[PDB]
Amino acid sequence: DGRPLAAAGIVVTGDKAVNIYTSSQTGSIIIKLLPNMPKDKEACAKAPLEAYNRTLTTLLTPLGDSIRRIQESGLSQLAVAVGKMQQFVNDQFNKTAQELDCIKITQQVGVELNLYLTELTTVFGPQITSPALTQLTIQALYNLAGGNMDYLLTKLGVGNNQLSSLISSGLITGNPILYDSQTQLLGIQVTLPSVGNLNNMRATYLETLSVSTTKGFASALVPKVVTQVGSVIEELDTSYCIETDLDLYCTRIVTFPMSPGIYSCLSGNTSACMYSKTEGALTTPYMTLKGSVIANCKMTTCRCADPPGIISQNYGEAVSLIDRQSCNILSLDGITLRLSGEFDATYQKNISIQDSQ
Amino acid sequence: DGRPLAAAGIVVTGDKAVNIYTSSQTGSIIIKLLPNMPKDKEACAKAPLEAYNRTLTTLLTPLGDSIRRIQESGLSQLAVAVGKMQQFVNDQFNKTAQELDCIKITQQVGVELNLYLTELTTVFGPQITSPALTQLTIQALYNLAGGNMDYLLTKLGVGNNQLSSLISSGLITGNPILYDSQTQLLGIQVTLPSVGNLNNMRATYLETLSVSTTKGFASALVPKVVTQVGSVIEELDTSYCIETDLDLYCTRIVTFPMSPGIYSCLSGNTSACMYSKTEGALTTPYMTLKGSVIANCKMTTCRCADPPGIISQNYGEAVSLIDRQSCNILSLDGITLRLSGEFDATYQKNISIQDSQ
Amino acid sequence: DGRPLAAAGIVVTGDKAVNIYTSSQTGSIIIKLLPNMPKDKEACAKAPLEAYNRTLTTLLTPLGDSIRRIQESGLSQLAVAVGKMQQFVNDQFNKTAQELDCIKITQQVGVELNLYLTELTTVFGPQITSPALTQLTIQALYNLAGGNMDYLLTKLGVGNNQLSSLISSGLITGNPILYDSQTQLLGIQVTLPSVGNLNNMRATYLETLSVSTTKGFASALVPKVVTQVGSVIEELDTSYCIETDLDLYCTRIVTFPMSPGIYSCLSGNTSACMYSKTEGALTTPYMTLKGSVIANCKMTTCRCADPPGIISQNYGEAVSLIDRQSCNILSLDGITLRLSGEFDATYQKNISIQDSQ
Ligand SMILES: *[C@@H]1O[C@H](CO)[C@@H](O[C@@H]2O[C@H](CO)[C@@H](O[C@@H]3O[C@H](CO)[C@@H](O)[C@H](O)[C@@H]3O)[C@H](O)[C@H]2NC(C)=O)[C@H](O)[C@H]1NC(C)=O
Ligand SMILES: *[C@@H]1O[C@H](CO)[C@@H](O[C@@H]2O[C@H](CO)[C@@H](O)[C@H](O)[C@H]2NC(C)=O)[C@H](O)[C@H]1NC(C)=O
Ligand SMILES: *[C@@H]1O[C@H](CO)[C@@H](O[C@@H]2O[C@H](CO)[C@@H](O)[C@H](O)[C@H]2NC(C)=O)[C@H](O)[C@H]1NC(C)=O
Ligand SMILES: *[C@@H]1O[C@H](CO)[C@@H](O[C@@H]2O[C@H](CO)[C@@H](O)[C@H](O)[C@H]2NC(C)=O)[C@H](O)[C@H]1NC(C)=O
Ligand SMILES: *[C@@H]1O[C@H](CO)[C@@H](O[C@@H]2O[C@H](CO)[C@@H](O)[C@H](O)[C@H]2NC(C)=O)[C@H](O)[C@H]1NC(C)=O
Ligand SMILES: *[C@@H]1O[C@H](CO)[C@@H](O)[C@H](O)[C@H]1NC(C)=O
């Protein structure tokens, strides 16, 4: 649509793609809670494994239960000394020899065992923590697509330029359907969608400030969201769509035709537009948008606190932009928005080993 | 309601129960961050404990802070050698004897400790992580109910058939209200609802495809949601209800009467139904629904690329109901949708010990 | 607004402040996954470090991947025995000596290393888990504001009495934008608002019960949400606002004027109020509210099961409140709610060390 209509008081808040989808595809992820241990060097490993396999059931038990409830619905003489004493220390040192191995080995098994639990909870946290559907971690999906993400999406329908969008959409969800307390096995059931992107159709979001022109009583009449494919341009009933920043995942596409004037305006012309005054006294002659503020500097007073100055707008402008680069600290008769700022920080740890005696 | 009206163009997207609820019940979970240690074996335990108790405060300090901020508002001669040498290795080995014990005991205490923290954060993750109200993990609800779930639900009003529903609802939440940094004590305050299920009442969500019948311009006129108790059938104002898959958790029940024609239609008859044509050119003739895709295959070609052949229909039917069995790949003109798919995967870890000497 | 209109059937569900906001401020967190280790005492720490630095990549690799995808778019003789024997046990014990140290040190480096991963995932869980925008944990904000929470809120705009609110708002979000697998460095980009609290303006939520007065058909006509600055009282279009419990974070303040009758009513007068009867047969004559229930105890028989009694209002009252203090178990012809009740429990762990020999 462009923004010549900006001068008409019509501000474009957003433009987005449109797609039809279905939660038809499906999949299952079967988690193996007890890691695959090496053959027999367990006598040592038995210690930590127990602690682990314990919290494990201390954790999952409830999740399991719920799953159920839901589903239901003398040189010669003394020389003897050297004989014994010598053989003895050998035996002792040997005990100590391997006695240092078990420790050395359990030491490692525990740590590895511990890493796995936090890894596990990090990845399937949602599922581990609730019986209902839940968003899937980026890790989970990936594993599910056996590291071959290119493959999965292609099956799903979207391209890379729709991954985050898809993710945030909250369409790819999963849930715990099985928990073998004895084998320590967890069965999650993912649910993917089959997005089918329409084409060359884009929904466009519209917002309107109280412009004067006709009079400071003016406020153009247009819909909130309109879609269009070619010359057609009808009002889109978004009620049937999940709406991400970039895409619009709709189950259906119900729409409505609009006055000929409306079309005429929204499409290049400005005059066609029909203002009016439903607005109340208290309505604010400015609005926020993408970390910026679009305001009818004529209707009020655009005072810029940082670069001192009044941000005025001559005729033809209809509405000013005011953003990070134009001004740095706006003030619109009552409030004071700060249009710029930063913060940096680092998160890190310093380990401190305590020597011993 | 049934589906004779499917012939009329009235597709029924869903049926759900209805219950009034009140966030009146309440509870408090008081966590003890430092595990109950055994009395005396400490000297060894102090090392790991310190580290843990350290990160504990590193994690909870901020959370603690916010809570405040929020609330404000020679046979004889050489024989001697054997005497000393002997007694000596005895003492030394004995040192090494118990010196191998501490290492063994802390080795254990560390792992147990470490596990408890990831357990702790998995269970009370939301709470530990934000001062506001947050969904309760299944594990926490359970603990709170002292393992006796049957008891709790009984008090909340619901039965097992509503457990998943409730959890999904988001009505059961908790928030931190206490954090003794010295004692290492965390105080969560749970808030449970008091759902009182209405009886024999059921809301039914309706949707409508552009049927022809009257002319390919047709499209029945009916509410989007209607509740009913026996012969009574009015429009439901869902604005006052958390909407779960199987249940509707409302705070009130606001409804409106409908045209006698409407009641006639929705209730068996089909003739009473009054169509119209408010739809626009771009409105798609096929909606989507739980994996399948209902569509007016009369209104557009429904080619199925998998088992080939046009899914057709004719007279009396109204709309096709392309299912997964029926077809594996729809093609409603311009947009091909997968209606079936699958994926499986396994999550498991292979520990890999290292040896010593 | 008060409650003299409570006699008119107008119940006030809530009162909230109003503020303008703009996601203009921005910040960046840069995590260091591998802790700062001590100089050359690694030989020992190398073992656990390996495991840790492994699971790290195991975890972050997908996240790192998605980020890319998105961004692309004989006294003399035997005396000799004592000579060697003695010297030997010395050397041997000494090995055992320091062989007991590495085990002591890695014992620690492990636990520390293990905690930092769960801490890390606890803190930047959302960010680690998804490439899209996600709520920031309290611990992250804190860190970002260098422990100096007061300064931050000052820059953002709200006061301490708006922290809880702000967090809940969900306006403060962050998202990964960089994962240096080699250095093991994560790069989160936070986004904070710049709420500019409007002043003395307040949005008042209104709801109405079917009062009789006129007749058990009455049902006053008033908006759902009205704002008011001084004597002005127009209807608010909350459409443009995030709605917290305490605050209303809007992007704009659209409003509409209301009949002079309306104004007259809402502002003290009761008569001016224009009732009607759009209500259906099935509409309930009582609502729920913050753990209590406002009801027309004249329309239905209000009976308190617990403290027995027939809660009943009287001419001019028009409605009743029924608190926890008032009653414990309310009964509204059909349903019974638990206006009160509690639960308490504790969560804690008991470590059980295993002895050795
Ligand atoms: C490694 O070096 C960093 C330097 O950035 C150290 O960071 C500092 O450590 C303190 C203590 O953990 C951090 O937390 C503090 O917590 C108290 C709560 O009692 C709070 O009042 C302080 O405001 C602060 O948040 C602190 O953020 C941080 N300070 C600075 C100037 O960096 C880190 O501790 C070192 N690693 C280790 C293990 O010591
Ligand atoms: C981990 O702990 C679970 C907890 O039960 C163990 O599972 C039980 O195993 C015993 C013996 O194999 C069975 O009699 C039980 O029926 C199992 N389940 C329950 C609930 O008791 C599991 O064997 C443990 N795994 C390891 C390696 O120790
Ligand atoms: C060294 O040898 C033994 C073994 O430790 C000592 O006798 C006690 O034995 C019991 C049972 O194992 C242990 O609980 C005690 O700790 C041992 N005491 C000591 C001091 O270790 C014996 O007393 C020791 N003798 C020498 C010379 O060190
Ligand atoms: C865990 O760490 C906390 C924080 O350092 C310790 O708390 C201190 O405890 C001492 C003794 O009770 C008090 O005098 C201080 O006032 C406490 N400081 C804070 C900030 O609470 C706590 O004692 C440690 N616990 C253990 C078992 O090590
Ligand atoms: C942690 O693991 C990563 C990946 O396994 C290691 O990264 C490699 O680092 C070497 C140099 O040390 C580079 O030559 C490789 O190209 C890196 N590979 C990848 C995939 O990044 C990293 O070295 C490990 N860090 C430590 C301290 O062991
Ligand atoms: C600690 O005691 C409680 C008793 O209420 C018990 O339930 C719990 O299992 C014990 N802790 C451990 C780790 O067993």
Ligand nearest to the CA of B49: 4
In whole angstroms, give the CA distance from residue B126 to residue B122.
9
End-to-end Cα spacing for chain A: 77
For residue B36, the SS3 value is: strand
For residue C186, the SS3 value is: strand
Answer yes or no: are the C-beta atoms of A281 and C254 closer than 8 Å: no
Residue of C nearest to B192 (CA): C342
Alpha helices in chain A (DSSP H): 42-72, 75-129, 138-144, 149-156, 163-169, 260-266
In whole angstroms, give the CA distance from residue C189 to residue A344.
9
Residue A338 has what DSSP assignment? B
Ligand nearest to the CA of A92: 3
CB-based contacts of A225, cutoff 8 Å, min separation 6: A203, A204, A205, A206, A235, A236, A238
Q: What is the resolution of this structure in A?
A: 3.3
A93 CA: distance to closest CA in chain C (Å): 8
A78-83's contacts with Cβ under 8 Å and 24+ in sequence apart are: A78/B75, A78/B78, A78/B79, A78/B82, A78/C78, A79/C78, A81/B82, A81/B86, A82/B82, A82/C78, A82/C81, A82/C82, A82/C85
Strands B225-229, B293-295: parallel, antiparallel or unpaired by DSSP? unpaired
Ligand 3 centre and the CA of B94: distance in Å?
6
| Residue C314: C-alpha distances to residues A266, C238, C299, C317 (Å) | 57, 35, 12, 5
Please indicate whether, in this complex, the C-beta atoms of C130 and A138 are within 8 angstroms of each other.
yes
Residue of A nearest to B87 (CA): A85
Answer yes or no: are the C-beta atoms of B129 and C134 closer than 8 Å: no
Ligand 1 centre and the CA of B55: distance in Å?
11
- Give the CA radius of gyration of chain C: 34
Residue A265 backbone phi and psi in degrees, to 5: -65, -70
Ligand 4 centre and the CA of B46: distance in Å?
14
Residue C30 has what DSSP assignment? E
Answer yes or no: are the C-beta atoms of C220 and C8 closer than 8 Å: yes
Amino acid letter, C111: V
C80-87's contacts with Cβ under 8 Å and 24+ in sequence apart are: C81/A82, C81/A86, C82/A82, C82/B78, C82/B81, C82/B82, C82/B85, C85/A82, C85/A85, C85/A86, C85/A89, C85/B85, C86/B81, C86/B85
B232 lines ligand 3 (CB under 6 A): no
DSSP for C254-301, please give it.
Answer: -EE---HHHHHHHTT-STT--------TT--SB--BTTB--B-TTTTT
Containing C243, the helix (H) or strand (E) segment is strand C241-243
Please provide the size of chain C in residues: 357
Buried b (16+ CB within 10 A) or exposed e, A190-208: bbbbbbbbbeebbbbbbbb
In whole angstroms, give the CA distance from residue A347 to residue A337.
29
Amino acid letter, A86: Q
- B262 dihedral zone (left: phi>0; alpha: psi -120 to 50; beta): alpha
The encoded tokens of residue C120 equal 């890390």
From the CB of residue A126, how many other CB atoms can be counted at a distance below 10 Å? Answer: 21
Residue matched to tokens 């709420």: C195
In whole angstroms, give the CA distance from residue A206 to residue C241.
16
Q: Which residues pair with A185 in a beta bridge?
A: A32, A180
CB-based contacts of C148, cutoff 8 Å, min separation 6: none
Q: Is A260 exposed, middle or buried (0-12, 13-18, 19+ CB in 10 A)?
A: exposed
In whole angstroms, give the CA distance from residue C43 to residue C49.
10
DSSP for C102-156, please give it.
Answer: HHHHHHHHHHHHHHHHHHHHHHTHHHHH-SS-EEPPHHHHHHHTTT-HHHHHHHH
DSSP for A66-80, please give it.
Answer: HHHHHHH--HHHHHH
The encoded tokens of residue A201 equal 């159709």
Q: Which residues pair with A147 in a beta bridge?
A: none
C182 lines ligand 5 (CB under 6 A): yes
Q: Among C141, C137, C121, C247, which residue's Cα sits nearest to residue C186?
A: C121
- Of the CA atoms within 13 Å of residue B286, those in its CB half-sphere come to 27
Answer yes or no: are the C-beta atoms of A293 and C22 closer than 8 Å: yes
Q: Which residues pair with A293 in a beta bridge?
A: A288
Amino acid letter, B118: T
Residue of B nearest to C86 (CA): B85
**What is the torsion angle, in degrees rounded to the nearest 10, for the CA atoms of residue A53, residue A54, residue A56 and residue A59?**
170
Please indicate whether, in this complex, the C-beta atoms of B63 and C139 are within 8 angstroms of each other.
yes
| Residue B152: C-alpha distances to residues B69, B137, B171, C343 (Å) | 33, 15, 15, 9
Contacts of B28 in chain C (CB under 8 A): 342-344
- State which ligand 3 atom lies nearest to the alpha carbon of B91: 28
Ligand 2 centre and the CA of A181: distance in Å?
7
- Domain spans, chain C: 1-23+194-280, 24-193, 281-340
* CATH H superfamily, domain B1-23+194-280: Newcastle disease virus like domain (2.40.490.10)
Residue A350 backbone phi and psi in degrees, to 5: -120, 110
Pocket residue to mutate for ligand 1, from C34, C36, C150, most atoms within 8 A of Cβ = C36
Domain C281-340 in CATH 2.60.40.1690: yes
Please indicate whether, in this complex, the C-beta atoms of B23 and C347 are within 8 angstroms of each other.
no
Q: Among A117, C351, A43, C44, which residue's Cα sits nearest to residue B48?
A: C351
For residue A340, the SS3 value is: coil
Ligand nearest to the CA of A61: 2
In whole angstroms, give the CA distance from residue A130 to residue C245.
25
Answer yes or no: are the C-beta atoms of C113 and A351 closer than 8 Å: yes
In whole angstroms, give the CA distance from residue B87 to residue A183.
52
In whole angstroms, give the CA distance from residue A132 to residue C207.
32
Measure CB to CB from residue B103 to each of C107, C280, C338 and give the nearest one.
C107
**What is the torsion angle, in degrees rounded to the nearest 10, for the CA atoms of residue B27, residue B32, residue B36 and residue B42?**
-170
Answer yes or no: are the C-beta atoms of B93 and A97 closer than 8 Å: no
Q: Among B201, B22, B173, which residue's Cα sits nearest to residue C294?
A: B22
Please indicate whether, in this complex, the C-beta atoms of C103 and A103 are within 8 angstroms of each other.
yes
Helix axes C42-72, A75-129, angle to 10 degrees: 20
| Residue C109: C-alpha distances to residues A241, A350, C49, C102, C232 (Å) | 51, 11, 8, 10, 66
**CATH of region A24-193:** 1.10.287.2480
- State which ligand 1 atom lies nearest to the alpha carbon of C142: 25
| Residue C307: C-alpha distances to residues B123, C255, C289 (Å) | 38, 46, 21
Answer yes or no: are the C-beta atoms of B206 and B224 closer than 8 Å: yes
Answer yes or no: are the C-beta atoms of C254 and A283 closer than 8 Å: yes
Amino acid letter, B278: T
In whole angstroms, give the CA distance from residue C28 to residue A59.
35
The encoded tokens of residue A58 equal 């201390």
Amino acid letter, B222: V
B301-305's contacts with Cβ under 8 Å and 24+ in sequence apart are: B301/B331, B301/B332, B301/B333, B302/B330, B302/B331, B302/B332, B303/B330, B303/B331, B304/B328, B304/B329, B304/B330, B304/B331, B305/B329, B305/B331, B305/B336
Answer yes or no: are the C-beta atoms of C244 and C50 closer than 8 Å: no
Buried b (16+ CB within 10 A) or exposed e, B243-266: bbeebbbbbbbbbbbbeeebbebb
Q: Which residues pair with A16 in a beta bridge?
A: A203
